[PDB]
Amino acid sequence: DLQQLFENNVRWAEAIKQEDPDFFAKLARQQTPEYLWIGCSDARVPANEIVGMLPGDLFVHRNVANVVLHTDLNCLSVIQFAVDVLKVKHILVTGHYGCGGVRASLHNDQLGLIDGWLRSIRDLAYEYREHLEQLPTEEERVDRLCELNVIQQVANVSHTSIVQNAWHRGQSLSVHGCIYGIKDGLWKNLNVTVSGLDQLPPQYRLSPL
Amino acid sequence: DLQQLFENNVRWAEAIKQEDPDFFAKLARQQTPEYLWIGCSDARVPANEIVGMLPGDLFVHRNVANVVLHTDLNCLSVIQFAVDVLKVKHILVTGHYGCGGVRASLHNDQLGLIDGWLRSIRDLAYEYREHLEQLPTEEERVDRLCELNVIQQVANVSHTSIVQNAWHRGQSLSVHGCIYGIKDGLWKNLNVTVSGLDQLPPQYRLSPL
Ligand SMILES: [Zn+2]
Ligand SMILES: [Zn+2]
Asked: Which residues sit with Cβ closer than 5 angstroms to ligand 2, an ion?
């Protein structure tokens, strides 16, 4: 039954309109979010509710296990529109504990198309195989890889020419790494924020155009 | 100031916990959403709030102008994990009026990387140039293309081997087209639902494996 979702919507919209009849009218005039959320598609991680944001506040990309690839025009279009047009001040890279995409990367089952998508997280598990092996349970390994993945994705966003050119032309722009606990509703800072070119390794820095 | 978002989160999580102290505990045990939302990244279109869903209810992919490409492992991984693993019953393709991605496709400015991303919407505008030309204002042209785009994206999802193989093996799966009014908060059905192979043109139907 899809009519519930429709009936919830009319209910939601009309409730808002009696509290502030101009809410959508004003909102529809300009898009000025300060934040881009790059997070997982997982149903248990909705961005706005988690950080208490209202419509208009958060530009959002969500994909499986919040993966950012430098050949992916899907995510890169979100990042570039966020950064070059909307000129967000902040990019919130948010992974979450118990992420099935990360977990799939740590196991050996073929899931099909998504096998390719998760390659770079599988790579991360190989890179940290000594660190992860050293952890006694599967849940610990999955959860640690989740942190590692977020931290990696933050690097990926920051190395984009999109982000570096924002900085080159003096734009205020910070990239953050957070992880959400689906078990407790808490959104945790991973303290890996990047806010400028000086924070990038020499091998990854691009010269201005 | 990002600490507000953090402070809102702790506030949100602890409020929920005093209403139902098990909410996250239960939620974290299994992911069982019935819906996949494929919508735009636009800050003024958050999925859960719009249809009144709670965490756990909606698997979500959001990208610029809700574009679904058959070479995009980003979106296709979300669709395939939704369909093959989570076995969603419904895919909600939701575009929205006043979509900048659609609008960009209708104008001639180079926006960079996102130029490639929006190619297929630009194609749609060319295909319907006679219909769209025939509309007196830019806002009408943009908004009409928005409907056309949603309708197209629904076709794209339905033609995926992911979706057809769901049907081939008897899985209940419906693809919907909706459009959200950022001006009034209303989520409208475009009445283009596809629920089976019989609804696909012969040229697009794939034989079972
Ligand atoms: Zn996940
Ligand atoms: Zn849009």
From this structure: B 40, 42, 65, 99, 101
